[PDB]
Design a protein around this ligand. Structure first.
Ligand SMILES: OC[C@H]1O[C@H](O[C@H]2[C@H](O)[C@@H](O)[C@@H](O)O[C@@H]2CO)[C@H](O)[C@@H](O)[C@@H]1O
Ligand SMILES: OC[C@H]1O[C@H](O[C@H]2[C@H](O)[C@@H](O)[C@@H](O)O[C@@H]2CO)[C@H](O)[C@@H](O)[C@@H]1O
Ligand SMILES: *[C@@H]1O[C@H](CO)[C@@H](O)[C@H](O)[C@H]1NC(C)=O
Ligand SMILES: *[C@@H]1O[C@H](CO)[C@@H](O)[C@H](O)[C@H]1NC(C)=O
Ligand SMILES: N=C(NO)NCC[C@H](N)C(=O)O
Ligand SMILES: N=C(NO)NCC[C@H](N)C(=O)O
Lengths: 367, 102, 367, 102
C-alpha cells in the first residue's frame, strides 16, 4: 500500500502522534494517517478478522492475547539493543505464547487524585473516607467519586487484602486459579458496598459523573489515570496525584496496563510499521510529541521515563504501578472482566450480597 | 404461542436454577414487577447496562449466569422474565414465574 | 424544536424529497433536513426507544406494527377528504390496533425484469426457465439471477401454489395460523432448490451479485422492485418490467409493501410533520419531485398513480401487486421473516431438505 | 474449565434435540469438520450470514432452532459446536459431540 494507518483512542494525544507521522513522511514519503474511531478494541478484531483494518492499533496489552490467539497481530522481533531501551516487564506484558506481539508505549496505573483546595492533606486509608464524607456533606460536598461501572476502577480496593485475577505459575496463567471470591476480595467489595449503603457514594456513579463532579469542585477526590489529567488541567481545579489509599493496612493494588502498539497481521506495511514504532515513536522526541499533546503518564522507554518521573503525577503513577498487578493477557480476560463487572455492580446496587456476587463471579471467570 | 405463566417447583430456602421459559433465540432478562402491579416499575435483578439506584434485594439472587434464586417468593413483587427476540428487541413477551414449594 | 428531520433509505430519491422540503421551508421558515442513514429500520427503534431520533421515518409498513406496539409512532387522524385521495387498502396497511400510524406513500411489489436484447419474449412460466438457462449457457449467459438471501424475493414463488404468512380472519391476524410448510410452499421451494441442484442458480447469489450480473448483460432476467430501476437506467441494458412468471398455472404472489411515512411519537413537531406529509409531499407535485429523482413505482395517491400507471413498469408493478398479498404488520413478522429466511437459505444451500426446513420454520414462526 | 468432548445418547435414525454443551452467555454455532480432520474446513449447518456453496447434508439437520438432528454420525465428518462468548467473539472454544446409540 505504501501508507501507514494508525488507530488510537481519542482521549490520547493523536495530534502529537500525527506530528511524529509527518516527520516520518518527510523522511520516507510514506503518509501516516492517525484516526481515533470509537470502540477500537471492538472495531479492530471485527475488521481485522476479515483481513482489513489499520496497520497499527494502540490499546492496553490485556486485550492483545485474544488478538494473538486469532492471529490478528504480527509477531515483532526487535533487536536486543532496542529491547534494552524498554523496561523488561513491559516486554513480558506483550508476549503471548512465546511471541512478542506489540511494542510497549506507556505504563498505566490508577492513582488517587484530590482537590488541593478542598483537601490539602488527602487521606492515607480507605477507612477514614466515611468520616471525611460526613464532614464534607455539611458543606454540600462529597469525599470521593469514581467510576463504579468499570471493574478496573474498583479492583485496586478489591485486590488490596488478597484479591487477584489469574494466578501466574510456571510461566503461564492458570485459567482455573481465580481469586475474586477469597477473603480479601470479599472485604474489599464489602467496604465499597458499605460506602453506598451509608450514602457516601451512589451506585450509578460512572466515568462521566465522577469526572464532572471532580472537575467542577463538587467532590474532593476521584480515582483515575493519566488520560484524565488534561480535562482537569483546563478545569482550573487545583489538584494533586498521589498514592492510592491503603485498605486494612495493605496498599491498593491497581491493575497495571501497558499501552502498546500492535501491528495488523494483515498489513502489507509491516516493515514500515516497525520502522515507525522503533525509530520514530519510541524515542525521547517521539514520545515527547505525544505526551505534549496529551500526557501519557509513565512510559516504557526508560530514557524518557527518567525525564517524566520528575513530574510528581508520573511519580505517583509509578508508585501505584509498583504496588499493583500486571493484567493477564489470556483470552479468558473477557469472561473475567464481565464476571467481575457484573458482580461489582450487582453488589453496589443491592441486587446481590457481596458473598453471593463474588462466589458466582468466581465460578464463571474460572470456567 | 408463548405461555404467559410458568409454574415451577423448588425446595424452599435453597438454591434453585430457574428453568428459563424464554424460547431459543430469545434473550432472557429477569425483573421484579413491584407489588405484582402491572402499572408499577420493573426492577432489574441483573444490571447489565437509565438511572441505577441501590435496592436491597437481600439473599434472593444467588447468581445471574445462570439465573439462580434462593427458592422463595420475592418480597418486592412478582418474578418476571422478559423474552426479547435476537433479531428484533421490539418483539418481546413477558413470562411470570410462580413457585410451588416441595 | 421548529425543525423537521426526515429519515429515508438511500436508494430512494432523497434529493427530490429535499426539494419538497425546501418549498416547505419557503412557505413556513421551518428547515427540513433529509438524511439517509444505513439500517434505518434498525436505527430508528433504537434511537426512538430512548425518546430521540428523526421526526419522520420512511419504511415499508410491515415494520410499523412492531413500532406501534412499543409506542414509537404518533397516531395520525387525517380528514376524510384526505383519506379518500389514497387507495383504501393502503390505509389498512398502516392501521395498527385500530389506529392509523403512518401515511402511505408508495405501493411496492416485485416484478420480472428482463433484458430485451437477450430475451425479447420473456417466459410466462417458471417451469420453462430451466430449458432457457440450458440454452443461454451455450452462449455463456444465464436465464435468471435474483437475491436468494432475502425471503422477500423468494416468497412470490413460494406463495403461488398455496403459501401464506399469517392468515387474516375476523379483522385480525392469527399468530398460530401460518402457511409456510403447506403443499404449495413445499412445491415452490422445491422448484427453487432444483434450480440450484441443476446449476441454473447459485446458492450464494445475493442482491449485489444479481444486480451486477443483470446490469452488465450477463443474465437475461432478474426479480426486483422500483428501487432498482435507476441503476439499470444508467447501465444501458435494454430492459422491460413485466408480470412475474406463473408456477403450476398460478400467478406468483409477491408480498405487497406500502412505503409509508411515520411520525416519531417523541417528536415535538407533530403538527408540522402532518402538514408536510399531507399538504406538500402527498400531492402530484410533491410525489413528482421524489419520483423524478428516483422512481417510486406505484403510489398510494390515486390522482398521481393515474399518471404513473402510464409507465409500463408501473403498470407491471400494479398487476403484480394485485396478484400478491399485503404484508402483515404484526410484531411477530420479525420471527416470521427470520424463520423463512433461514429455511430458504438452508434449503437453497443443501443444509436441509425442503420439507424439514419448512416444517421447522412453520413451528418457529407460528410460536 | 470447558470440556472438549460431549458424549450424548439418542435413538438412532430418529429426531434428537442436541443437548447444547456451550455455557450460558455463549453463542452456539454448529459445524461439520470435514473428515474429522482439524486441518480440513468447517461446514456450517445453519447459514445465518463468505462464499456459500451447495452441499447436500441430506436428512441430517431436522431443525436449526432448536438444533435437532436425525440421530446419526454425519457422513461428511465430525459434529462440532463453536461456543462464542457474548461479550467477545474472540473468546471461543469448540466442543465435539459424539453419539452413543441406544
Ligand atoms: O474495566 C475493565 C477494563 O479495564 C481495562 O481498561 C482500562 C484501560 O486499560 C485504561 O487505559 C483506561 O482506558 O481505563 C480502562 C477502564 O475503563 C482493560 O484494559 C480493559 O480491557 C477492560 O475491559
Ligand atoms: O426479506 C424480508 C424483508 O422483506 C421486506 O423488505 C423489502 C422492502 O419492503 C422493499 O422496499 C425492498 O427494500 O426490499 C426489501 C427486501 O430486502 C420487508 O419490508 C422487511 O421488513 C423484511 O425484513
Ligand atoms: C433469605 O431471606 C429470607 C428473609 O425473608 C429468609 O426467610 C430465608 O430463609 C433466607 N434464605 C436463605 C438465607 O437461604
Ligand atoms: C437418513 O439418511 C441415512 C442415509 O445414510 C439413512 O441411513 C437414515 O436412515 C436416514 N434417516 C431418516 C430418513 O430418518
Ligand atoms: N467459520 C469460521 N472459521 O473458519 N468461524 C470462525 C469464528 C472464530 N471464533 C473467529 O473469529 O476466529
Ligand atoms: N426495563 C424496560 N422497560 O421499562 N425494558 C423495556 C424493553 C422492551 N422490550 C422495549 O424495548 O420496549
Amino acid at each position: 500500500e505504501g501508507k501507514l494507518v494508525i488507530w488510537i483512542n481519542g482521549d490520547k494525544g493523536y495530534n502529537g502522534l500525527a506530528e511524529v507521522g509527518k516527520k516520518f513522511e518527510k523522511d520516507t514519503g510514506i503518509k501516516v494517517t492517525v484516526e481515533h474511531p470509537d470502540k477500537l478494541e471492538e472495531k479492530f478484531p471485527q475488521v481485522a478478522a476479515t483481513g482489513d483494518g489499520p496497520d497499527i492499533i494502540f490499546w492496553a496489552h490485556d486485550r492483545f492475547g485474544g488478538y494473538a490467539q486469532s492471529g490478528l497481530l504480527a509477531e515483532i522481533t526487535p533487536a536486543a539493543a532496542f529491547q534494552d531501551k524498554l523496561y523488561p516487564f513491559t516486554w513480558d506484558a506483550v508476549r503471548y505464547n512465546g511471541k512478542l506481539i506489540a511494542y510497549p508505549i506507556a505504563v498505566e496505573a490508577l492513582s488517587l487524585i484530590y482537590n488541593k483546595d478542598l483537601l490539602p492533606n488527602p487521606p492515607k486509608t480507605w477507612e477514614e473516607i466515611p468520616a471525611l464524607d460526613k464532614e464534607l456533606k455539611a458543606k454540600g460536598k462529597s469525599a470521593l467519586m469514581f467510576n463504579l461501572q468499570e471493574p478496573y476502577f474498583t479492583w485496586p480496593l478489591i485486590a488490596a487484602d488478597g484479591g487477584y485475577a489469574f494466578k501466574y505459575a510456571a510461566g503461564k496463567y492458570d485459567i482455573k486459579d481465580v481469586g475474586v471470591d477469597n477473603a480479601g476480595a470479599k472485604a474489599g467489595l464489602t467496604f465499597l458496598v458499605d460506602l453506598i449503603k451509608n450514602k457516601h457514594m451512589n451506585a450509578d456513579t460512572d466515568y462521566s459523573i465522577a469526572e464532572h463532579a471532580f472537575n467542577h469542585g463538587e467532590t474532593a477526590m476521584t480515582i483515575n489515570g493519566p488520560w484524565a489529567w488534561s480535562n482537569i488541567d483546563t478545569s482550573a481545579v487545583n489538584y494533586g496525584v498521589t498514592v492510592l489509599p491503603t485498605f486494612k493496612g495493605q496498599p491498593s493494588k491497581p491493575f497495571v496496563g501497558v499501552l502498546s502498539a500492535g501491528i495488523n497481521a494483515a498489513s502489507p506495511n509491516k516493515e514500515l510499521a516497525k520502522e515507525f514504532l522503533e525509530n520514530y515513536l519510541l524515542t525521547d522526541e517521539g514520545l515527547e510529541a505525544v505526551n505534549k499533546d496529551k500526557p501519557l503518564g509513565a512510559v516504557a522507554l526508560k530514557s524518557y521515563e527518567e525525564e517524566l518521573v520528575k513530574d510528581p503525577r508520573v511519580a505517583a503513577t509509578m508508585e501505584n504501578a509498583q504496588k499493583g498487578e500486571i493484567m493477564p493477557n489470556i483470552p479468558q480476560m473477557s469472561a473475567f472482566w464481565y464476571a467481575v463487572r457484573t458482580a461489582v455492580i450487582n453488589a453496589a446496587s443491592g441486587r446481590q450480597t457481596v458473598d453471593a456476587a463474588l462466589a458466582a463471579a468466581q465460578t464463571n471467570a474460572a470456567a | 404461542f408463548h405461555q404467559e405463566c410458568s409454574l415451577q417447583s423448588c425446595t424452599q430456602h435453597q438454591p434453585y436454577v430457574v428453568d428459563d421459559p424464554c424460547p431459543i433465540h430469545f434473550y432472557s432478562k429477569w425483573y421484579i414487577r413491584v407489588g405484582a402491579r402491572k402499572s408499577a416499575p420493573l426492577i432489574e435483578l441483573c444490571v447489565d447496562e437509565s438511572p441505577i439506584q441501590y435496592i436491597d434485594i437481600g439473599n434472593y439472587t444467588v447468581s445471574c449466569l445462570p439465573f439462580t434464586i434462593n427458592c422463595q417468593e420475592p418480597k418486592l413483587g412478582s418474578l418476571v422474565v422478559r423474552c426479547s427476540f435476537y433479531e428484533d428487541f421490539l418483539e418481546y413477551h413477558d413470562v411470570r414465574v410462580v413457585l410451588d414449594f416441595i
